[PDB]
Write a protein that binds this ligand. Structure first.
Ligand SMILES: O=C(O)CC[C@H](O)C(=O)O
Ligand SMILES: [Mn+2]
Length: 228
């Protein structure tokens, strides 16, 4: 089915119908007027961040380059390979940018301290893919630029997702969601799921341990908040 979209639900409604039972939802009307939504053009990103070093996932390999280099080589003109400025705490590195986002009020329903929320940037061209995996905290994934196709499988379906057997990769599925090898992974075909296209100004709540797969449909910038 499709992930439900709710306009500014109350704290109590979010807590009781989504957070506690662990059900995904898209929050509308919450981040849609954060400054980032209008300010973060490529040129703005170059002006504020261009000379800073960032980690870039290529393909598979992990490298380092400036933001200006990342934009030149992997975004504009005609890139040779897929590169993704993924899972990077850009807002700790560049506090000016932190002024363009906010901590969602819903995070205060958690048990953790605000100081310990991890804020990551996800900036890349059309076609970046984060394979199906699960994380150990709650997440608000805020879409700023472009759209993402997202598939969500409940932790109750873990047996059908064939996690990798190493402790290191045990949080990641062996299956390629959009082209699954059903000869090797036959249980995957019948596993139920939710999906959405997440658009600018929308927030996706990914419950703790919910399996998620993400493909960028356009040049994309997302900001995740990992919280408890
Ligand atoms: O947006 C992506 O490509 C991955 C999002 C990530 O898995 C998260 O935990 O926020
Ligand atoms: Mn994740």
């Amino acid at each position: 089915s499709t992930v439900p979209r709710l306009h500014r639900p109350s704290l109590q409604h979010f807590r009781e119908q989504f957070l506690v039972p662990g059900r995904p939802v898209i929050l509308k009307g919450v981040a849609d007027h954060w400054p980032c939504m209008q300010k973060w053009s490529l040129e703005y990103i170059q002006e504020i961040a261009g000379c800073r070093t960032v980690p870039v996932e290529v393909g598979w390999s992990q490298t380092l380059m400036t933001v200006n280099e990342f934009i030149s080589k992997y975004i504009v003109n005609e890139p040779r390979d897929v590169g993704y400025l993924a899972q990077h705490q850009l807002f700790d590195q560049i506090p000016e940018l932190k002024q363009d986002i906010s901590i969602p009020d819903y995070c205060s329903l958690g048990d953790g301290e605000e100081e310990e929320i991890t804020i990551n940037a996800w900036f890349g061209p059309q076609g970046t893919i984060s394979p199906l995996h699960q994380d150990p905290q709650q997440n608000f994934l805020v879409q700023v630029m472009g759209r993402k196709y997202i598939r969500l499988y409940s932790p109750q379906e873990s047996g059908a997702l064939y996690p990798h057997d190493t402790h290191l990769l045990h949080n990641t599925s062996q299956v390629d969601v959009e082209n699954p090898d059903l000869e090797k992974f036959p249980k995957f075909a019948k596993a139920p799921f939710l999906s959405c296209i997440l658009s600018p100004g929308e927030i996706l709540f990914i419950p703790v341990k919910y399996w998620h797969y993400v493909r960028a449909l356009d040049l994309s910038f997302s900001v995740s908040f990992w919280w408890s």
